[PDB]
Symmetry: C3
Subunit: 215 residues, 3 copies
């Protein structure tokens, strides 16, 4: 399940499979994709928050019970013309780490861990390294990718992945306050700014999609 | 007004509209462009400092009383074969933030704020994001661009934008001392190094110029 | 001289010209190149450590007693399908700084300095700036390249160049422990991950090789 709500002109997506640490299934992604495509044209909606249920995980990534449907999710996140805030209520690992990094702004709390443990399951990584490098450069990215380690919140914040660290019980309010502030920016400049970020990163995104079929 | 001086073989450009927080006008930029083109062939001149007058601002950016003439300024800064030190006597915002980041080395003091508040005036940004990303990666850049916030000096220094933080009254001396040290480097290796930085960043620079007409 | 050893399935390359601060000569590089090409197909070998002899330097860089043979070394380091850990027993300067940064993981201790002092000898730099920028962005890179300064260990670690700082006498054990942990990762995902890092950086590598003939 995924929940949808609004807080004034801010649409909220809550990942809601807490007993599976909000791990992704294909129907959850299909629903989130549709919602992302609506919020984007929807006039009630000036910004978007994604968050997870409970206090253990934003999302653990793939339910341990194709590369194209994933590309369709990444593409729907990259297409937004409106600001997207990640309210990290806990750990974001694997494909959830990637989704979190496709948000505009990240807020977490001190128990949030982030990273990409795919190598330990024998999965070769293409999307993660692209996105991590575009934010961190090749030295952090290589170590993160080959170790598969989860970084603590403080490290995430210090290297620029988490923009705000607050008390666990304030994560959502801080996320709302940021989303509200970004909702107030002039919409044309917002859309054009976001389109510009997309264009700057598009060749690298295409490259790692194509590297993904192959590899 | 803009002032020109020399301190031995170091040419100094002082931005001198203090009552307007050294905000840029078209005649100031025209004059600075000419000076930058002379200092580059001038044999008396082994390095260059830019600084602003007074203690409130390096520059506030555009006088609140085209994209091509701006491109001509950026191009004149990128063309130098000689080292360019930014003595940040105060805040560098908007297009002044960009100019500051086209220097080789930045020196400031603890009250210096930096950033790009263009979104709050409904201006879409193309140059800023290019330059910020080339130094900071996409996570800091996106947040800086969509918030339009001014960063404090300590943040600027910690993330690598400001190379030296010193006492407000030492900013210019530290700038001179750095410029003097760089003036002493072998000139051929300096010019070739600087040409190499230009070549590494040129495709991204072209891209954001062309994105600028469009957007 | 260069020493070769194994610690279980970890091959170890020790740079062994301590009286010349392990500065590179052409026969040392020729030997290291061959060893790197063997370890890569060798079935006994799941990971590789490079380190230097003594306690003053990993390597000082070029023996102060062509750009193609160097490119052959860089290419042999980039070709590994197996993890490469840099046990930094001391300072890595000039071309040794570059080699160190072509490792996957770096471990040092608090007296390790790193950087590129080439400008002070009138050498123009192309490889260094490429690699430093891919890890650090253009602001740190420009300052490092034009100053030619050596950074302290703590700075290296904070900006992400050194992954682990430990006591001088623990550097090698920490390097072994990391190399052992990476040796245990599934080999196919390791090789594919490393090939992916190579592909992401290959155009920039080609560009700076070609800039190297010219410049």
């Amino acid at each position: 399940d995924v929940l949808f709500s609004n807080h004034g002109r801010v649409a909220v997506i809550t990942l809601n499979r807490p007993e599976r640490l909000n791990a992704w299934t294909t129907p959850m992604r299909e629903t989130i994709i549709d919602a992302l495509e609506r919020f984007n044209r929807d006039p009630e909606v000036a910004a978007i928050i994604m968050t997870g249920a409970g206090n253990r995980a934003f999302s653990a990534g793939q339910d341990l019970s194709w590369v194209k449907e994933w590309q369709r999710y990444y593409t729907a996140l990259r297409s937004l013309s409106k600001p997207l805030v990640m309210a990290l209520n806990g750990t974001a690992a694997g494909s959830a780490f990637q989704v979190a990094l496709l948000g505009d702004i990240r807020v977490g709390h001190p128990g949030v861990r982030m990273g990409q443990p795919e190598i330990n399951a024998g999965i070769a990584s293409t999307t993660g390294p692209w996105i991590m490098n575009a934010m961190l450069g090749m030295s952090r990215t290589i170590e993160l990718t080959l170790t598969g380690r989860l970084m603590e919140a403080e490290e995430c914040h210090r290297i620029g992945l988490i923009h705000h660290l607050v008390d666990e019980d304030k994560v959502f309010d801080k996320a709302l306050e940021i989303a509200t502030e970004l909702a107030a920016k002039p919409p044309v400049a917002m859309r054009l700014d976001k389109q510009r970020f997309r264009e700057m990163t598009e060749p690298g995104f295409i490259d790692c999609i194509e590297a993904g079929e192959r590899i």
